[PDB]
Amino acid sequence: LFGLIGAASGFILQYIGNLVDYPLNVGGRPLDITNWPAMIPITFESGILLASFAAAIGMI
Amino acid sequence: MQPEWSGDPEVKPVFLAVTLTGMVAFLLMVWLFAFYW
Amino acid sequence: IPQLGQVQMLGLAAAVIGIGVLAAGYFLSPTSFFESYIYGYYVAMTIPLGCLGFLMVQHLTGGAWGVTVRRMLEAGAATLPIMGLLFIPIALGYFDTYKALGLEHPLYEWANPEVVTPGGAEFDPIIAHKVPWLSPLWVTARIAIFFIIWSALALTLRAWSRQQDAGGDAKKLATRMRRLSGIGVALFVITVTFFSFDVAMSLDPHWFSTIYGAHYMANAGLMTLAFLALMMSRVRDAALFREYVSVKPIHDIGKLIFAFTVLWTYMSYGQLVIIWSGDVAEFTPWYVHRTQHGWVFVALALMLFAFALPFFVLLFRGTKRNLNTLATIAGWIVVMRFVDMAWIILPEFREHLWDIAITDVAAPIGLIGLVIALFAANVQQAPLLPLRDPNMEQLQN
Amino acid sequence: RDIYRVGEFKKFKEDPKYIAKEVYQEEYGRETPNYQSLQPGDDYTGRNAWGMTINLNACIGCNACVVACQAENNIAVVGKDQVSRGREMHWIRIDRYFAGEDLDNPSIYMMPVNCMQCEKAPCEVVCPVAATVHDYEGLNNMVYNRCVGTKYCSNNCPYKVRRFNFLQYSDTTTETFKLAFNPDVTVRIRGVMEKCTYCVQRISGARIAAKRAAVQAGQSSYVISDGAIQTACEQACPTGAIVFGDINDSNSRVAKWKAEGHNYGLLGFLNTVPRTTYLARVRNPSEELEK
Amino acid sequence: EAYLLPGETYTSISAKIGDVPLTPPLKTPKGWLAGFSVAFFMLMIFFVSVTWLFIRGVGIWGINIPVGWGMDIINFVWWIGIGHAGTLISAILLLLNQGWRNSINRFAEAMTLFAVACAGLYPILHLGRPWLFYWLIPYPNTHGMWPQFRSALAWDVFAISTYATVSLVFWLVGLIPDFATLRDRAKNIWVKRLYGIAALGWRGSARHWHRYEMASILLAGLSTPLVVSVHSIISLDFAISQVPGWQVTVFPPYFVAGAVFAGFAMVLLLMIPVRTFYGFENYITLHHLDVMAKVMLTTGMIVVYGYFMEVFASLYSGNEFEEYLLYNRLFGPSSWAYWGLLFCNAVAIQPLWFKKVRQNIPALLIISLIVSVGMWLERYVIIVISLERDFLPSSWDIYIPTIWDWSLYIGTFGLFFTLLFLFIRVLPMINIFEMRLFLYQETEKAKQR
Numbered sequence A: 001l002f003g004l005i006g007a008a009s010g011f012i013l014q015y016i017g018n019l020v021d022y023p024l025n026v027g028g029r030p031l032d033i034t035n036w037p038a039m040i041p042i043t044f045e046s047g048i049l050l051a052s053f054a055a056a057i058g059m060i
Numbered sequence B: 001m002q003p004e005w006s007g008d009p010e011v012k013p014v015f016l017a018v019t020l021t022g023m024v025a026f027l028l029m030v031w032l033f034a035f036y037w
Numbered sequence C: 001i002p003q004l005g006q007v008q009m010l011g012l013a014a015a016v017i018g019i020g021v022l023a024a025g026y027f028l029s030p031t032s033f034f035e036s037y038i039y040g041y042y043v044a045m046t047i048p049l050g051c052l053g054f055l056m057v058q059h060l061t062g063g064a065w066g067v068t069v070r071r072m073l074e075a076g077a078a079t080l081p082i083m084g085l086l087f088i089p090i091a092l093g094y095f096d097t098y099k100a101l102g103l104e105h106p107l108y109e110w111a112n113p114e115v116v117t118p119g120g121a122e123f124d125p126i127i128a129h130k131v132p133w134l135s136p137l138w139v140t141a142r143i144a145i146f147f148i149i150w151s152a153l154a155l156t157l158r159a160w161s162r163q164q165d166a167g168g169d170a171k172k173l174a175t176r177m178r179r180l181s182g183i184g185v186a187l188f189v190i191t192v193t194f195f196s197f198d199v200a201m202s203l204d205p206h207w208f209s210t211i212y213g214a215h216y217m218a219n220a221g222l223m224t225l226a227f228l229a230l231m232m233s234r235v236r237d238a239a240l241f242r243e244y245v246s247v248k249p250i251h252d253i254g255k256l257i258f259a260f261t262v263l264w265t266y267m268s269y270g271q272l273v274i275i276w277s278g279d280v281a282e283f284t285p286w287y288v289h290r291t292q293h294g295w296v297f298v299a300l301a302l303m304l305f306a307f308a309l310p311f312f313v314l315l316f317r318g319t320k321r322n323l324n325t326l327a328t329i330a331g332w333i334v335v336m337r338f339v340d341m342a343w344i345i346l347p348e349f350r351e352h353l354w355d356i357a358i359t360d361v362a363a364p365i366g367l368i369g370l371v372i373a374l375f376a377a378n379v380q381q382a383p384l385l386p387l388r389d390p391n392m393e394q395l396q397n
Numbered sequence D: 001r002d003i004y005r006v007g008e009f010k011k012f013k014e015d016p017k018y019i020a021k022e023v024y025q026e027e028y029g030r031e032t033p034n035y036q037s038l039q040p041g042d043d044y045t046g047r048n049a050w051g052m053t054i055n056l057n058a059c060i061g062c063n064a065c066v067v068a069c070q071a072e073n074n075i076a077v078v079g080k081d082q083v084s085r086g087r088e089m090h091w092i093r094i095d096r097y098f099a100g101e102d103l104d105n106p107s108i109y110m111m112p113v114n115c116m117q118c119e120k121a122p123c124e125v126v127c128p129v130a131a132t133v134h135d136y137e138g139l140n141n142m143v144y145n146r147c148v149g150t151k152y153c154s155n156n157c158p159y160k161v162r163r164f165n166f167l168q169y170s171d172t173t174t175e176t177f178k179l180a181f182n183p184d185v186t187v188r189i190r191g192v193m194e195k196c197t198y199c200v201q202r203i204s205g206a207r208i209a210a211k212r213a214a215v216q217a218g219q220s221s222y223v224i225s226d227g228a229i230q231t232a233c234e235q236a237c238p239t240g241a242i243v244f245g246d247i248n249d250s251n252s253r254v255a256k257w258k259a260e261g262h263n264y265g266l267l268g269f270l271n272t273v274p275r276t277t278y279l280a281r282v283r284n285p286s287e288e289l290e291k
Numbered sequence E: 001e002a003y004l005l006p007g008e009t010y011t012s013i014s015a016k017i018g019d020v021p022l023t024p025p026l027k028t029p030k031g032w033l034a035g036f037s038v039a040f041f042m043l044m045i046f047f048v049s050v051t052w053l054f055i056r057g058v059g060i061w062g063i064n065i066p067v068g069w070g071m072d073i074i075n076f077v078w079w080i081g082i083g084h085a086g087t088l089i090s091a092i093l094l095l096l097n098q099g100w101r102n103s104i105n106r107f108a109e110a111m112t113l114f115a116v117a118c119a120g121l122y123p124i125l126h127l128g129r130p131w132l133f134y135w136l137i138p139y140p141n142t143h144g145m146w147p148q149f150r151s152a153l154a155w156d157v158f159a160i161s162t163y164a165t166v167s168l169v170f171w172l173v174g175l176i177p178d179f180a181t182l183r184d185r186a187k188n189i190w191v192k193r194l195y196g197i198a199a200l201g202w203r204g205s206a207r208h209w210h211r212y213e214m215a216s217i218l219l220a221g222l223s224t225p226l227v228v229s230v231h232s233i234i235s236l237d238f239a240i241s242q243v244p245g246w247q248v249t250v251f252p253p254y255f256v257a258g259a260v261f262a263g264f265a266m267v268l269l270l271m272i273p274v275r276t277f278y279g280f281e282n283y284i285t286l287h288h289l290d291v292m293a294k295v296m297l298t299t300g301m302i303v304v305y306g307y308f309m310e311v312f313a314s315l316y317s318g319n320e321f322e323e324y325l326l327y328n329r330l331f332g333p334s335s336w337a338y339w340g341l342l343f344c345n346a347v348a349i350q351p352l353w354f355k356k357v358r359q360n361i362p363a364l365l366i367i368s369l370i371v372s373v374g375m376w377l378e379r380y381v382i383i384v385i386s387l388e389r390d391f392l393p394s395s396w397d398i399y400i401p402t403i404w405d406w407s408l409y410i411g412t413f414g415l416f417f418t419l420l421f422l423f424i425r426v427l428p429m430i431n432i433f434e435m436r437l438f439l440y441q442e443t444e445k446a447k448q449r
């Protein structure tokens, strides 16, 4: 549950921040869902972080 | 299997206390970082 | 033995059907016959190379799954001389005998004298720069050396395992195959990477990738792991796996399948993000060709059904503890590996999603049916598990 | 490498694209390069798109553009020890190149290299805080208030035009130098990256003037003229090698120079689409001596 | 051989591991005192170097306009790659069901945490404006600014923060019943509460052991792709660039292999004095050293394969920049790094195939030190040589490191050893549980014959 929450939050934060809240042209890279690379690492790290927090705090 | 605190009458009061603390802290952070200026 | 005969006749029938449809398509397009045969060879080599690779990995790192699937790995890896015999149509495609076989312009771009010689019609200078390395003689010598290495390695490991089963010290004839596996993992990695280079990436010499070949290793590993899950589900009632094999080798096999699904999408995504973020025109035409003309739909299907579906159905404990669910997931996975090698190889010939012929599905199905029949005939010659092995105690759990 | 492109006059008269045709024929075997990118970029179809065209045939190497850029943009003077460490601060450099068939007497090839303001900027992609972004007008925006070191913009810049304040290079105590500083350009502190901005003080001043004139006349649309922006290097060039103007305006001098066949950009295989393009040097040799 | 020597009981394991901590500070060994004095002197060197860096600037180093990343980034990748093997022993060996993790995982995960602690300062230290590291973090501000998130350094922010946090969490989870054992074995009533509040009343309950084993399994199965993603992202902060030495697509598994290589080099180089100075020959065995050197040989072979991939890419490409990258590495002004790299990562690993050399202790120490030096040379070759000579030959210069980045490197060595000596003073070097459980498992294996 918290891994899904972390992956969703890590994608949504990058999407809103780079694409909705502040659309910036950097490197000519896309301003839509075509910018789905360079969102996967922070998405995955957020999912891993909240899933490991879930494992620890949920066990305790 | 059941959890350790299953059957304890304090479990739902402490869950409502934790969720109330989380929503108050979330709303307060949202107020400070979005509606404060 | 009944299920082995059933899968042997199933693979024989699938091979007959695939070779018949491929030979029917050869008379209408002899070029596309060989272009589909390259893709079929690339698909059908994922099983024996992966069987040799996990045979050496389980010999180095012993396990209950390793002694469960070890004889299947030996039977799969023993088909590699026949794969060396089946590479001959590709070699005759890129030799000078292409005119006698109906193929009008040679099978690889570096077999063109007009491309690799100065003063020719095309004279691509990059391909002409790679003229000693990417030549028919050097490529045939390299792939033949690789076949010799694979065949000697697999035959020595299988012969040592059969000698261990028949007569001799089980502990002494385990260190020998562990040492042979220790040198053979390094030889296998460099050999399979250069084989994948010279077979797949040598179609378009304008583009190079160094994670390629190891990505093919992850692809072949996932393909033969799902193959092992399907065969392990098929032979679950054979009076040898009923007594000595429990659910823990099944759990280990499912965990390995999940781990190498994650590893395959890792090796695909790393290459994709490197080429996408570093916008160099030496590398971006690969993903342009793999995105244009409907190939973006196949890429999205690889995102959705080769990673997002097996990652979520293999994340649960019960779906890998059950052989029926593991076999269904493994069948979906090998279908998605067929789609993945299609997305990798077929943009080099077809250029469009709607330009895919029936030879492109006849060649890998028939040639993997040949792989099925050869593997079943090889595993029918031996007991399914190494009873006289030091690592037999790992099956007791 | 295809950086300084040299041609002859008679073959230029026959066909002005033959320099690029010969370069790409030797490199790829085809007359034109089919450079393919995975990034879309921006559009630039109805907007003021700014670019530079440097004429290598008309550059002598007098460094007047470099001194003008320093004077206009407050580029700090570092020590001789700091240049020996490799940390010179110059937004435009003149790259002498000594190419010839004998290096004991070669031909001298001078070329001004500033920031190309690349539409797909490798400096822009690798900035972790978006301190360097791209304009609606088409300029790379090196923001010093935002720049936080990390020195990666300079490692992903293929031309290495970006200069980093490794120490406190700008003078803080000399009142005469403080008076010498341009009030309309910032003075950079230690720890920030600086590079060529197409004199965006003048770009912003002319854009504000054009918008103010547009609303004072009621036109509801600002037009910036071709001579309205003149950068410091373009102004102080005694030869006129550097020309600055609008790309989307076809009647502008930069668009007319970029419509020439010998116009080219540096390192096109890196899909950057440079806006500072170069005109190849066209020589005029005599038949009694060379030909 | 065996991973546990015979003649051990559960109480003997508990006493022999927990009696090296919980000793009075007046009974502290002189070897520990001398090592901590050396570590504290080099930590004073760290403080002096960091203070002079913050006073003067990042211009005290040798970095310049073409080479903007130098010894700071080399030591960053080196120190962050030390921790991969400890994360591997803590997580991947738990996933694989390998019984040799039970006596090396505590020290190796502590080494991972201290190496990440040393390598997390290096972004902030090299940053040039060090007090604005939080602008790379997505935080709410009055500007409305965001990090780019398309750069690999934002992924590095997320990956380093997640790696440090999950590594510390998994280490503390693996310490909680060891905290219970120390709380039980303590003598003074005031040091009972030091480990009591960290054990949280563990009780050793079988209901608690089920949830503990499930949490450890899921933490291992989350930390394996975590550590692979962290070292892939640290590969990507070169591999997303257009630099000819850096736009190489085998860098994520190549950096994973190099990090595991250097990590087990440092792990062997710090097990061997711990094994010979504490009574841990029964726990850390010759089989442990043999299998750690086997993983060193395997991962070093993968790094040698990565060298062959880069050389093949340079020779196979018709690209003049790849050809000159190979020429510059072979015969450049910094070709000493490439040649010493080839000697220290290719020649020195062919002895590790041999069983006698694998079992030999001083040969293992020499090989581990040579591999650490050659991995520093590898990161030098990747960063500095590729940044030295670039596309435009006018922008070519030589990177000469000063005394200050060397002083910072020596100081981070001192910080690492200070944290390690504090860890071996107040905490057990090896896991008290899961080694008595390993003894129970070996007893069950002997009963099953």
Ligand SMILES: CCCCCCCCCCCCCCC(=O)OC(COC(=O)CCCCCCCCCCCC(C)C)COC(=O)CCCCCCCCCCCC(C)C
Pocket: A003, A004, A007, A040, A043, A044, A047, A048, A051, C255, C258, C259, C260, C262, C263, C265, C266, C269, C315, C316, C317, E095, E217, E218, E220, E221, E222, E223, E224, E225, E226, E228, E229
């Ligand atoms: C290009 C991006 C690729 C995305 C990679 C995704 C991989 C993440 C996997 C995390 C490991 C969890 C396994 C738990 C476990 O130990 O499983 C047990 C069975 O016990 C259970 O019932 C499961 C416990 C809870 C599982 C829930 C996981 C939460 C979701 C993760 C959040 C991520 C986001 C993105 C959703 C037994 O199974 C195993 O032990 C198998 C472990 C396999 C390890 C895989 C190693 C591959 C290394 C390559 C890494 C690739 C790079 C790109 C990350």
Ligand SMILES: CCCCCCCCCCCCCCC(=O)OC[C@H](COP(=O)(O)OCCN)OC(=O)CCCCCCCCCCCCCC
Pocket: C057, C058, C061, C062, C063, C064, C065, C066, C214, C217, C218, C251, C252, C253, C255, C256, C259, C263, C394, E092, E095, E096, E097, E098, E099, E224, E228, E253, E256
């Ligand atoms: C290092 C970065 C990548 C890590 C990925 C590794 C995969 C981790 C998750 C997979 C779990 C596999 C299931 C568990 C298992 O079967 O392994 C334990 C196994 C059996 O142990 P017994 O229980 O039988 O008892 C023995 C001791 N009492 O032990 C093994 O044999 C280990 C299996 C070897 C794994 C092979 C993975 C190699 C990764 C290759 C990656 C490709 C590189 C391409 C360049």
Ligand SMILES: CCCCCCCCCCCCCCCC(=O)OC[C@H](COP(=O)(O)OCCN)OC(=O)CCCCCCCCCCCCC
Pocket: C049, C050, C053, C054, C057, C060, C061, C062, C185, C189, C217, C218, C220, C221, C391, E096, E098, E253, E254, E256, E257, E260, E291, E294, E295, E298, E299, E302
């Ligand atoms: C197509 C198929 C894929 C093939 C992949 C081949 C390339 C991968 C390398 C092979 C990995 C095998 C590791 C062998 C190391 C070893 O010998 O250790 C063995 C240990 C324990 O063995 P024991 O105790 O001595 O005896 C057992 C028999 N009685 O077993 C292990 O499980 C440890 C292996 C841990 C794997 C870490 C290495 C991973 C490489 C990192 C780079 C990967 C890039 C992503």
Ligand SMILES: CCCCCCCc1cc(O)c2ccccc2[n+]1[O-]
Pocket: D150, E073, E076, E120, E123, E124, E127, E133, E136, E137, E153, E154, E156, E157, E160, E161, E237
């Ligand atoms: C709060 C955690 C932030 C610490 C990590 C910062 C990330 C970071 C920032 C940088 O400027 C880098 C420059 C070169 C190489 C790596 C870098 N990393 O990782």
Ligand code: SF4
Pocket: D058, D059, D060, D061, D062, D063, D064, D065, D066, D094, D112, D233, D236, D237, D238, D239, D240, D241, D242
């Ligand atoms: S001032 Fe003009 S002629 Fe002189 S170096 Fe600059 S661009 Fe060339």
Ligand code: SF4
Pocket: D114, D115, D116, D117, D118, D121, D122, D123, D124, D140, D156, D157, D158, D159, D160, D161, D162, D195, D272
């Ligand atoms: S020339 Fe350099 S600094 Fe300017 S936009 Fe291009 S990469 Fe960035």
Ligand code: SF4
Pocket: D065, D068, D069, D070, D072, D073, D091, D092, D114, D115, D196, D197, D198, D199, D200, D231, D232, D233, D234
């Ligand atoms: S255009 Fe202006 S800022 Fe750019 S190099 Fe020329 S003088 Fe300097």
Ligand code: F3S
Pocket: D126, D127, D128, D129, D131, D132, D147, D148, D149, D150, D151, D152, D153, D154, D192, D193
């Ligand atoms: S990478 Fe970015 S943070 Fe500054 S130094 Fe370069 S613009």
